Amino acid sequence: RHEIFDVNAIRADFPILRETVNGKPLIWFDNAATTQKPQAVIDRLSHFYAHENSNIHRAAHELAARATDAYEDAREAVRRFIGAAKAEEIIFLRGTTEAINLVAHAWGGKHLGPGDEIVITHLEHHANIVPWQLLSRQTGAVLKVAPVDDAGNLLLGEFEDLLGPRTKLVAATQVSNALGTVTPVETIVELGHRYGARVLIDGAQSIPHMPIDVAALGADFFVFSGHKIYGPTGIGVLYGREDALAETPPWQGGGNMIADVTLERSLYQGPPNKFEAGTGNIADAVGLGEAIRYVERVGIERIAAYEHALLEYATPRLAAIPGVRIVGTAQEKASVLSFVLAGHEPLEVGKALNAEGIAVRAGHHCAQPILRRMGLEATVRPSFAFYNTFDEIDVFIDAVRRIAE
Amino acid sequence: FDVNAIRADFPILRETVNGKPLIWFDNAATTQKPQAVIDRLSHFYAHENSNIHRAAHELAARATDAYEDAREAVRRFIGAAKAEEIIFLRGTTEAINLVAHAWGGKHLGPGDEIVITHLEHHANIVPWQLLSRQTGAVLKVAPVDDAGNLLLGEFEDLLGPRTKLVAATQVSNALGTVTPVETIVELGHRYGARVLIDGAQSIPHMPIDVAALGADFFVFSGHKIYGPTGIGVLYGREDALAETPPWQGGGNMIADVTLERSLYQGPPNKFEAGTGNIADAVGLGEAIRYVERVGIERIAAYEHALLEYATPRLAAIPGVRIVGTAQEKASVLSFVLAGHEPLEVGKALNAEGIAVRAGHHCAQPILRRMGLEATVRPSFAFYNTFDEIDVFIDAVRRIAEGSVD
């Protein structure tokens, strides 16, 4: 299957898509919050627990060798899918938020001091804001925020103007989870390096929607969450260039990250072990590897083109409903279609849509600053994935129209 | 105690190694899962999967119900007074790092003293060493006798007016020693310290009542109590949590974010940054219900019988020395064999189908205290049998009667 792309064939792999809501078909437009899982991922987890479950270290015994094989294969699946040079540059942790906190606490506390500057974009999710605020109060570093225009495009000229001799770190989202804006990460990384800064890229909403090649990109850190790319909850990745991880001290301490422990002093292993303390989340890493293989079978460029067709279809029909204002109309977008409706609270629109079976989020989407920049406290945010259909979009448009009338 | 009916629930127990039935004596590293836990995870992914916040939409409400019920199952099972005292994270190691970085960062300064025991797992050593090196806090280690018993007089002699924290294991993963945690807590409190209890090896083997114990913190890992990987718990008394600043920052733990500053939620949200591992918490709740149906006092009695049966029969083999003969033990039976290195013994046992750990068990200091670099360590769980113990005893005696190294 999936030699040719067909959305009904694809949808058939996702069991929850046959679920019913209030007597109506489920329409999952909440992909920017989390995605639904293919049967192969569910079955990969079941198979691991029934046939492979153990802590790792292949010399121990048979099941330990099975679990070790699966864990190493999962790390390699991540390395291959994002184009990292080495599996030693792939760190498993719980998700994007833990990965950014790792970089902030460990790398930031080692390298930042008073007056040093961190540049983030106005488009950031809270996961890429709060850790820099914590670090900035701890170290005296100054946090600068690169601005956007009213359509939500990052302004590259103002961004370059914020860079200077005090710039040590740029942390930028590749895809805004609230507006859908795609940012020019190649340019951001090149500019950051030109001024001597390390560059972290928040890829939680780019990795499901466009091909990623971190080696070509050159970013020093790249982070994402497994549950937003059809994988299990509880698993995510920090990619770090070998030289960036070498200058990052250990963060969490305990088993696996040590080479030798005495009561007076411990020595630490190299990466990836250096940053993985305690028993890893072995089963969900293995499930994430299965999710990556599923996405590769379908094809990330085919996913990107199909999802682009969905967004291109939905946006004008939504915008033509009287009272609707689209929020986020950047030159390039992926998946997310925030809007508001005059005279109606976003949350009541979300609840009416749920009454139609349609799942969306209405709220600030853990991105209050960008919404305030747009003059708003909340938006209604359908977000599309490659198992969504044009027919589902039609149902959603009719529902919004009936609310507006 | 019907071990055969219980064994029927664990599918992996049907696996074979070298054409021989698997014998899982590696429970101190991780446990195997009942089909109810595996199925609970599958059911979640196929029918309930969503981020939380029940007002959003139907699946979000299903996910919120399941996550709240998991937190309440943990609260009930460990005897905590409030669900707000239960923090979900990856495992024991993350929980201890939370207390060390956040509580310790605020409360352990130059000259303040930390008391741990000689029995600690690396997870309850390295975080205190890292904190100590950051702040000038002083780490003291309470000794044991040659049998592996905690010496209560010497422990109390370590306490004084500068003791801020006692961090003690309840059950040693390398020796099986059960420590007198009620005495430890009462003594620490008398001298003015908070007390953290490492329960990763006590919670599967004996009843836990943290409100009656009075411990300030209690930590454990889901995968050592028949649950999924990637999930564990920090319990903290609400007054202890009230004096603990946030650790990781991001979504869920904030109440409001502006570019200037972020305000934080109260507990448990305060300590859970980002998307939680919803599915594995749900699976851990299912594991807790399984243990509760069997009965933790019945499990404790049966496992005590297993250990009592095994210890003299293993000790009677010429060449064998038992490592850890404390007055009260649970699960673990470390030993060494003259003329054989532990790892080779472990591999030979695996050739017979028997899974054990051979090594330092992430507890190098206690093994050095015993004069050793490594031990062979079977550890028993309530799906193990006397027959499996007989196979193990015969395999050890064949190794002992064979050629030395």
d(CA B274, CA B249): 8
Domains along chain A? 7-37+299-404 (3.90.1150.10), 44-296 (3.40.640.10)
Q: Which of A97, A278, A366 sits opposite B248 (nearest CB)?
A: A97
Whether residue A186 lies within 8 A of chain B, CB to CB, comes out as no
Collect all residues of chain A within an 8 Å Cβ-Cβ radius of residue B250: 97, 100-101, 125-127, 130-131, 366
Resolution in A: 2.1
Whether residue B270 lies within 8 A of chain A, CB to CB, comes out as no
Q: How far is B51 from chain A (nearest CA, A)?
A: 6
Helices (H) then strands (E): counts for chain B: 15, 17
User: Best mutation site among B42, B57, B201 for testing chain A: the one with the most A CBs within 10 Å?
Assistant: B57
Whether residue B357 lies within 8 A of chain A, CB to CB, comes out as yes
| Cα separation of the two ends of chain A | 43
Main-chain phi, psi angles of B357, to 5 degrees: -95, 140
The reply to whether residue B347 touches residue A59, judged by beta carbons under 8 angstroms, is yes
Q: What are the start-end ranges of the H helices in A60-149?
A: 62-82, 96-102, 109-111, 130-139
Chain A residue with Cα closest to B349: A61
Whether residue A265 lies within 8 A of chain B, CB to CB, comes out as yes
Please, how many CA atoms are within 13 Å of residue B231, restricted to the half-sphere of its CB?
Answer: 32
* Residues of A with catalytic function: 366
Q: Which of A166, A13, A261 is nearest to B122 (CA)?
A: A261
d(CA A373, CA B116): 50
| Cα separation of the two ends of chain B | 41
Whether residue A17 lies within 8 A of chain B, CB to CB, comes out as no
Residue with tokens 């109590």: B225
Q: How many CB pairs under 8 A join A and B?
A: 291
Whether residue A108 lies within 8 A of chain B, CB to CB, comes out as no
Residue with tokens 């437009």: A29
| Helix axes of A390-404 and A346-355: crossing angle, nearest 10 degrees | 120
The radius of gyration of chain A's CA atoms, rounded to the nearest angstrom, is: 22
Residues within 8 A of A (CB atoms), B 188-227 only: 221, 223
Residue with tokens 């309850």: B124
Q: Residue A245 in contact with residue A274, Cβ under 8 Å?
A: yes
Q: Is B279 noted as a catalytic residue in this protein?
A: no
Whether residue A142 lies within 8 A of chain B, CB to CB, comes out as no
d(CA A278, CA A250): 13
Q: How far is B279 from chain A (nearest CA, A)?
A: 6
Whether residue A269 lies within 8 A of chain B, CB to CB, comes out as no
Q: Residue B34 in contact with residue B280, Cβ under 8 Å?
A: no
Which of B90-102 are b and which e, b meaning 16 or more Cβ less than 10 Å from the residue's Cβ? bbbbbbbbbbbbb
Which of B167-201 are b and which e, b meaning 16 or more Cβ less than 10 Å from the residue's Cβ? bbbbbbbbbbbbbbbeebbebbeebebbbbbbbbb
Q: Which of B47, B94, B97 sits opposite A19 (nearest CB)?
A: B47
- Cα torsion for B263, B266, B272, B275, to the nearest 10°? -70
Contacts of B392 (CB under 8 A, 6+ apart): B23, B25, B310, B314, B349, B354, B378
Q: Could you give the 3-state DSSP secondary structure of residue B220? A: strand
Q: Are strands A361-363 and A358-359 parallel, antiparallel or unpaired?
A: unpaired
Q: What is the DSSP letter of A247?
A: T
Chain A residue with Cα closest to B17: A62
The reply to whether residue A368 touches residue B256, judged by beta carbons under 8 angstroms, is yes
What are the beta bridge partners of residue A258? Answer: A268
The reply to whether residue A283 touches residue B230, judged by beta carbons under 8 angstroms, is yes
The reply to whether residue B362 touches residue A26, judged by beta carbons under 8 angstroms, is no
Hey, what are A247's tokens?
A: 């200058």
Q: Could you give the 3-state DSSP secondary structure of residue A21? A: strand
Collect all residues of chain B within an 8 Å Cβ-Cβ radius of residue A369: 257-259
Q: Which of A26, A51, A277 sits opposite B93 (nearest CB)?
A: A277
Whether residue A19 lies within 8 A of chain B, CB to CB, comes out as yes
The reply to whether residue A280 touches residue B229, judged by beta carbons under 8 angstroms, is yes
Please, how many CA atoms are within 13 Å of residue B227, restricted to the half-sphere of its CB?
Answer: 33
